[PDB]
Amino acid sequence: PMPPSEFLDKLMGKVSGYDARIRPNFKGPPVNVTCNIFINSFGSIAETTMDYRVNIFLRQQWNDPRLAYSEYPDDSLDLDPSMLDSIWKPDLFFANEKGANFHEVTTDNKLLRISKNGNVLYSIRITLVLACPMDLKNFPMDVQTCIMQLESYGFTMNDLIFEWDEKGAVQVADGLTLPQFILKEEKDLRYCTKHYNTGKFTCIEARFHLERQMGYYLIQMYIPSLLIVILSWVSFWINMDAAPARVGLGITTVLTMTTQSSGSRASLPKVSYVKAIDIWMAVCLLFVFSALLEYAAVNFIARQHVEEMRKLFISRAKRIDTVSRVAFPLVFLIFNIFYWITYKII
Amino acid sequence: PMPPSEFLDKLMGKVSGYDARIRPNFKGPPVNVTCNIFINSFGSIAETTMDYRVNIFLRQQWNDPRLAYSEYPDDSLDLDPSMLDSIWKPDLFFANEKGANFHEVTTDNKLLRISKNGNVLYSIRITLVLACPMDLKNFPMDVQTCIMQLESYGFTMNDLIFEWDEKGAVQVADGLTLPQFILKEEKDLRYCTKHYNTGKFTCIEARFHLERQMGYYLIQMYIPSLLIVILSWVSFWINMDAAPARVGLGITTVLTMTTQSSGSRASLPKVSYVKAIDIWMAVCLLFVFSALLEYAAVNFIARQHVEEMRKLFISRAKRIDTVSRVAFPLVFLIFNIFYWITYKII
Amino acid sequence: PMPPSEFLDKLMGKVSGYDARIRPNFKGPPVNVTCNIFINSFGSIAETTMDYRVNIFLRQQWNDPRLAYSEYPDDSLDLDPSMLDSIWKPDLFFANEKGANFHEVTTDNKLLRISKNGNVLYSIRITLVLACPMDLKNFPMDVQTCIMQLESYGFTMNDLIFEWDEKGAVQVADGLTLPQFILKEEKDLRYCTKHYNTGKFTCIEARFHLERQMGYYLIQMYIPSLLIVILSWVSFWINMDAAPARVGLGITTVLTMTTQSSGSRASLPKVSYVKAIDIWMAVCLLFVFSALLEYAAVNFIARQHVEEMRKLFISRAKRIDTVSRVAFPLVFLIFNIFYWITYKII
Amino acid sequence: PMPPSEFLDKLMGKVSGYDARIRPNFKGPPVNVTCNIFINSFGSIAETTMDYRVNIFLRQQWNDPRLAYSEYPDDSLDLDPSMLDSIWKPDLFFANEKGANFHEVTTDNKLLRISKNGNVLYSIRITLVLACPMDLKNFPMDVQTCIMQLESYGFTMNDLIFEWDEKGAVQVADGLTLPQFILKEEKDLRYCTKHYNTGKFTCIEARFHLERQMGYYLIQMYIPSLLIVILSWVSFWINMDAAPARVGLGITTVLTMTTQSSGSRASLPKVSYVKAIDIWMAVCLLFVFSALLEYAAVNFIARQHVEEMRKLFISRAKRIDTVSRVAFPLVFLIFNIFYWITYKII
Amino acid sequence: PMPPSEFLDKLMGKVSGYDARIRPNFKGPPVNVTCNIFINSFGSIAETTMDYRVNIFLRQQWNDPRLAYSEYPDDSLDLDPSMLDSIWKPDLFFANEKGANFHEVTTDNKLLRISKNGNVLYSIRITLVLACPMDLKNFPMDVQTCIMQLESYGFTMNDLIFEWDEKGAVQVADGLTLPQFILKEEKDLRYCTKHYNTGKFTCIEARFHLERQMGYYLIQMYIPSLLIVILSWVSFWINMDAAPARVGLGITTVLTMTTQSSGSRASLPKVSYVKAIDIWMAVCLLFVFSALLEYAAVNFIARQHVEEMRKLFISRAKRIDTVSRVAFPLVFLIFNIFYWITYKII
């Protein structure tokens, strides 16, 4: 018989009247495109720009009655992408592209196959840099929902309807891990149908839930801030009433708590609200600032001067150095109970 | 009847004499293009480069009498962007482009429709990186007006006239938020008509007012600078006349006020003038520098030595340590009144 | 006779029926493409992005019976890449591209030659930025296996089969060195055959083992952390019972151990687990934190006060200053034995 | 009559013999192209790369006798840039391009008009990243002359001659300001005619003088270096002969003078010579290093020990503490006179 | 006579049989291409990536007997680059491209001219980012030889032979200076002929010797490290036996020697070996670490306690403070002799 590209040239080129500019089912029902993606790569989830780079295989399936061949014996006629500008294709785009490209190495990475009843599979490889707003109210313990939405640009709802398929509409690669987050297996598949003054346009989207990994900030942020709070508690044991060394232990633990507070937001967006790492690095700034403020209470009370009055202010200098020695591991530990149970209920 | 692209091929291609190089209403009135944009994304407003990245849907509407079909029954003939190089289009550009691109993922993201009387809607998706000059005289409390202006390049005022439409000429996406600024709902829509030695060229523009979010600099810049000013006031309570510890408390609070002053302009343009964060981080540098300068007044007066003269310089060492203990929370708090009321009237 | 391009124009163009869209051995056995690469450049192995940039010469060899010329006297007809869009080529791609490009300087850097029996060599120059997951559990002493895999996109296993050849399927350039790693000469050449809902697709890959160079982190990370642990041991010799100087030697060696701990992960991914440089910079943080905690045991015991009791607490102040003077070079050196022998067995 | 593009198609296309490959005035005088630019944007003047990004409207005017229409009634036939590859255009380039691009948003931003005698105006919008060598001998007080030069590539002096016009050959936009520099209104317009082994080629250029804004480095560099020099002068008033506090005031003001010296060249090229900020941050490093060296003269002389000899070394400890208290605001202020008057004569 | 492009159209297009796919001197001697470059710009020599960006005019000269016109009166027929895809051109590439581009501003920056005997000059402007391995064993005093090599891709030695010409095969622009290096005038011009399993391919290259400028690291690295070594020598004059101030002068000069050591490799590749700035910043780390280790010898010997024994340990506390006061400017200055004479012989 005929070779299939030449068999398909008479199905398209100038003898069958196939016009690649005019959609199937024209002057009738709209085209029902059913979509599913395959995430090869995921990640580089920046928060300064609030975006993430995904790498998908975008599969699209629609029906074209004009491509319904009826006397070739096989079931799937493929097509190399040189003659892929000769069929109708849906004008899908992404509402939050922020730059995206195809992949054109050794061949344009595209796929086409045409079934006997005109079912057209069409798979392209796309790298997207998708925008998602970061809600950083509880910053190391937040579940980010970053989405991607697939709209139509030139055709309204009575021309082209996007759907997800029901056979697992978002697949994910086999060992797809992330350095900072983990990807949850529940992916919401819902509609996002838009409206403009141009009209209404179809839209489908897929939410991706991105639970963080708390195990990094529990090494850089929370534990070296925990040691400086213990370091200020050395000053209650130093020289048993007062010293010039307790000043320098009260100065320095405020410095590398302030510098570490400024280093807790080194590569973050400049959000207006106050977040979970901002109410840990500022309350523990208060425990190391009150330790030198504790010494200013000792060095002013104990340096005051009958024969009875000598032992009355040193006894007010030991009680301030044996209550504050135990009350600071009481106020700090009850904050430690209040901080993490609040961010487990949330 | 005819399919619409084939119906439009005889309206354009070589049988109707439609030349895509020659504007409508030729040798007559100029073409009245009416424009409106739709901001999908906004932000990444850098100040080192003084620019911002917007993502718009640029809609244009003009009238073409040559496209006035009169016997097709519908009201809107669309066109896929393959045959969009076959009509006349206005040569709109942006006077402050600084790099811009189209969006060509899965289809060139363009729109066309032609009404019965020749009204042509034309919508393209553009990512712009628009230049705006930053007036940073009062830096965390400024209202930036960053603009975008839409000129004509090859055609003068007697050939092509840009207008905004009256039905909401700048729309904004639904939940369009910003990390650092907030976008005000009042957008000025005015003319910017240019003049060269080539002639005069039409221009329309849209001002965008960008009020900041003070809630970030009120966490990193103003509060850790507030604590160091309190930290120098510890030195008035330390050892009740003088100490070697009051030197190290007078040295160190100048260091991490100077280092924090140099860190208050880490990612800013190198402007010549003096700004609001520069008159807070330098006046509070003076409160922590005068505290060690207060100790140089104590340690020189009190270390001077009849039997009357012993109690005359210690009484000049307590008065300097009980006036300065209260006058510094008087001079600093009256600066705190003077600083923020000045930047609320402005 | 004929010039070879004109001799090949009648072998391809419209007189021989050679269709560049239809694979050889059609309706028969699949095409057996045999591949081998030549690594010109290698490196820029980033860990923030977890990728690496390679520069290869991708050679492909398949058989085309339609190109079997039989009366030209030579053995290898080449072809400049202008008429290289006129033959069939396999649609090889890389499953972890993350951006890649050709090289088109002074000529498209491509090669073609056609043997007498239709054997087609095809060599192109590609720059790849290949993704590989970093397993950083033992960070300066890990052997990274970063791969690259060569799939087919549009053709299944019954259409196109990739193979490596047996004559050294991965060559490497002559003096190809790396700044941070070294490349091992054993390269695994195995199959990675994929499966989708589209079907199954061929895949071959090549593992690259990248042993690090420990000699850099043995200069910046481990030795300046070794000196601060020695620096805290000065405090056992300072003023022979206690001093205000031993406080400042116990404060400061915790600071530049904490700051150096935060600088041990300056340009690394934010992984959740705990790595080899994280259990060196935190255990040696404990040796410099226990030195000031040793002084808090001295300054509280020795400052307590019959005539017998005066020499009983100073003898408990020398024993704590002659056991701890030797036990800390015992506990630290047995950790030094335990740390490096663990990472030589692994 | 005829529409003008169709009137110009018979002036160019295959009936008039107009060849777009062969210059006007051929086998005669060379083509006299007269140029003028319009700077829309200017800036991002980096010094690490030693370049600057300009955005110009490059206007070119030459004479083509083959385009001299003689029976159309108007005076200026324009042309949309689709048929702009059909006329002769000069092969102007920039000798210091370092990357440059056109602007192709919504239309290729080009202009053409043809007068009745064949005068051809041609305006394109270009973004350039032009290289200029930075002479940083006196770094905050230098006048940089960064140039741009417009050569011919394929045609020698007997084929194509570039000129500036006399009606303001370099215009500048209306409110074109800069963050770091200011642009002087005097722009030199001179020749730069090149010579190779290929021959000699025409060249015109325009110098741009870029005076800096001293008001930034007078806030970050010179004033916080001025305060540390005052901070070392506290040590002459501290404890009136000697102290352990004067050591820590002599140590620390060398540290944050050295760290501030290393931060005075954070984002600069690594030039070999010594610049104006390098002889301020090193001489003021000597005033804070001699202050601790002053204490080493006090603490060695005054700690030496008949009944006459007790008051003879303390009188050599007050004279060294009342000469050096006044001589350092004498040597530093005469350096302050010598530093700025030297950089006002230059 | 004929216009030259039309005179050259009959020399190339379909009447002379000139095939642009088939090299000159076919079935005979190979094509002898003679090359020479002209370096316009040079620099941005990064060491993290180990590459450098050059901007060349690549001239190529070969002989084509098919272009030997014999009845046109002139000597050099040029050609605008529109019809430059119509001649044979050599497939030169660079073996270490790492990304490169042409320059296509206002015209494709290309040149062609054809002499009467068929000599073809061909000059293109290229920006290269060429890879070179950095040998940083003696880092501020090394002579880097960074190369560039010009290979053939599709043609072997019996088809196409590259040569340098003898009339100055590498020219350099007039005032081509560098910020960090200087370019030596001796440039080696030698062969680099490659061999693969494809065959052997021609190659020519040009070594560029890049001597550094020592005058930058002699300001940031060596002199502020020289002052800290002098700063530790203050401690021998402080309080004449021992002090708590000599501890803080022995602590701090180890800190900002360690921090300055970590800042001596801020923007360098992470090489395994030990370099010249690594044996200066570590030996001078030993002079400031032995100064506090000198105090631990004083404070333990001098604090030991008959009537004879009182003056026997203070005399062992002055001898350790008058030998070490002079021996450290003896051991450091003999290292200063040993360090720089070693790196002048090399």
Ligand SMILES: *[C@@H]1O[C@H](CO)[C@@H](O[C@@H]2O[C@H](CO)[C@@H](O[C@@H]3O[C@H](CO)[C@@H](O)[C@H](O)[C@@H]3O)[C@H](O)[C@H]2NC(C)=O)[C@H](O)[C@H]1NC(C)=O
């Ligand atoms: C593409 O998908 C759309 C929506 O899934 C399909 O439209 C639906 O088509 C059915 C079949 O005719 C319609 O059912 C009809 O409903 C009318 C009452 O409205 C009833 O009188 C008829 O007997 C029949 O049951 C259905 O209303 C319609 N829905 C919408 C929202 O338009 C469309 O047919 C699909 N196209 C193709 C080619 O499969």
Ligand SMILES: *[C@@H]1O[C@H](CO)[C@@H](O[C@@H]2O[C@H](CO)[C@@H](O[C@@H]3O[C@H](CO)[C@@H](O)[C@H](O)[C@@H]3O)[C@H](O)[C@H]2NC(C)=O)[C@H](O)[C@H]1NC(C)=O
């Ligand atoms: C495009 O917009 C321009 C400006 O909006 C329109 O130009 C205006 O056209 C009107 C209609 O002819 C002109 O009014 C006339 O004014 C003259 C006096 O100048 C009067 O004698 C006539 O009876 C008539 O009322 C108006 O002057 C003119 N304005 C300008 C600035 O040119 C133009 O018509 C629009 N084009 C289309 C196709 O709608």
Ligand SMILES: *[C@@H]1O[C@H](CO)[C@@H](O[C@@H]2O[C@H](CO)[C@@H](O[C@@H]3O[C@H](CO)[C@@H](O)[C@H](O)[C@@H]3O)[C@H](O)[C@H]2NC(C)=O)[C@H](O)[C@H]1NC(C)=O
């Ligand atoms: C491309 O490579 C594939 C796999 O290497 C080749 O397929 C193999 O072809 C041989 C030759 O016919 C097959 O052997 C046959 O096996 C059947 C039993 O299945 C036996 O009855 C026959 O007598 C014969 O020995 C072999 O099964 C087949 N293997 C597979 C997996 O398909 C193919 O021939 C190669 N194509 C070319 C053009 O070289």
Ligand SMILES: *[C@@H]1O[C@H](CO)[C@@H](O[C@@H]2O[C@H](CO)[C@@H](O[C@@H]3O[C@H](CO)[C@@H](O)[C@H](O)[C@@H]3O)[C@H](O)[C@H]2NC(C)=O)[C@H](O)[C@H]1NC(C)=O
């Ligand atoms: C393009 O510009 C060049 C230079 O501005 C023009 O060349 C100049 O043309 C004039 C007019 O013929 C020449 O003057 C002649 O000088 C000779 C002596 O050399 C004298 O005998 C004649 O009577 C006449 O005055 C002039 O020398 C020549 N200059 C150069 C450097 O070539 C050229 O004409 C311009 N082309 C056009 C089309 O305007």
Ligand SMILES: *[C@@H]1O[C@H](CO)[C@@H](O[C@@H]2O[C@H](CO)[C@@H](O[C@@H]3O[C@H](CO)[C@@H](O)[C@H](O)[C@@H]3O)[C@H](O)[C@H]2NC(C)=O)[C@H](O)[C@H]1NC(C)=O
């Ligand atoms: C391109 O350059 C190559 C090498 O420079 C030229 O090849 C050389 O051509 C000469 C001229 O025929 C050869 O000399 C001959 O040597 C044989 C012995 O081998 C001798 O019997 C002859 O009498 C004659 O002297 C020379 O061997 C040959 N060298 C190589 C390496 O092939 C070639 O001719 C040049 N092509 C053109 C068009 O100039």
